Amino acid sequence: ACTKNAIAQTGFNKDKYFNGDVWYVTDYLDLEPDDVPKRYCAALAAGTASGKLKEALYHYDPKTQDTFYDVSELQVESLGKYTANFKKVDKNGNVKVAVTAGNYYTFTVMYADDSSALIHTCLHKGNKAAGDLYAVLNRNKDAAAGDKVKSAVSAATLEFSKFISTKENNCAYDNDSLKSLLTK
Ligand code: HEM
């Protein structure tokens, strides 16, 4: 299902990435066909909350209106490479689906700077078939991918021309919920 051992950025700066702020997905590449929709909105917050490494996720399908949030405790495999549980929550952190063995994702930061990043994730959810998902992130939801992150896509032996943009979906995000979910 997933096939890639993504390599984390050399010299990854964890405190800068996990600073409590929001990252927007601007472009994505799924290696498995028919795995995710062709139009999508996603964002996350990443930070340490009371000593615990956390991510809060948001997904929105702009055609179906399917919406869900997750809160994730990350465990460290190596610098920039994590295994995350997930619990599905409402935007206020109330649990809808508890943490469960077999529901996890891996998360590898392949490149990051203050404004942009390239990540890989492999999602394992119960019975479902997994597939490699790469995402270009930016701190600014409207930013076109710049040369640092596009060069990193090339250095991963990927073609940025294959990535699908999220920019034409009228995506609107609740940054406040993502930040507050880090504590939940
Ligand atoms: C930003 C990095 C991402 C991470 C870490 C991530 C992680 C996850 C997790 C944990 C779930 C399961 C949530 C739950 O059931 O509670 C999920 C579901 C899903 N994600 Fe992502 N995701 C990311 C980005 C994306 C992107 C960019 C897309 C496609 C444009 C996408 C498409 C989906 C879809 C379609 C599901 C629903 C799968 C199902 O039917 O259960 N995700 N994702």
Swiss-Prot record:
The keyword Disulfide bond applies. GO terms for cellular component: extracellular region. It comes from the Eukaryota. Its main location: secreted. Binds 1 heme b (iron(II)-protoporphyrin IX) group per subunit. It catalyses: 3 nitrite + 2 H(+) = 2 nitric oxide + nitrate + H2O. GO terms for biological process: vasodilation. InterPro entries: Calycin, Nitrophorin, Nitrophorin_domain. It is found in: Secreted. Keywords: Disulfide bond, Heme, Iron, Metal-binding, Oxidoreductase, Secreted, Signal, Vasoactive, Vasodilator. GO terms for molecular function: histamine binding; metal ion binding; nitric oxide binding; oxidoreductase activity. Disulfide bonds join C2-C122, C41-C171. Salivary gland (at protein level). Heme binds at H59. Its EC number is 1.7.6.1. Its cofactor is heme b. Superposition of the structures of NP4 in the presence of ammonia or nitrite shows a conformational change of the protein upon NO(2)(-) binding. Belongs to the calycin superfamily. Nitrophorin family. Heme-based protein that delivers nitric oxide gas (NO) to the victim while feeding, resulting in vasodilation and inhibition of platelet aggregation. Reversibly binds nitric oxide (NO). Also binds tightly to histamine, which is released by the host to induce wound healing. NO release is pH dependent and linked to loop dynamics. This is Nitrophorin-4.
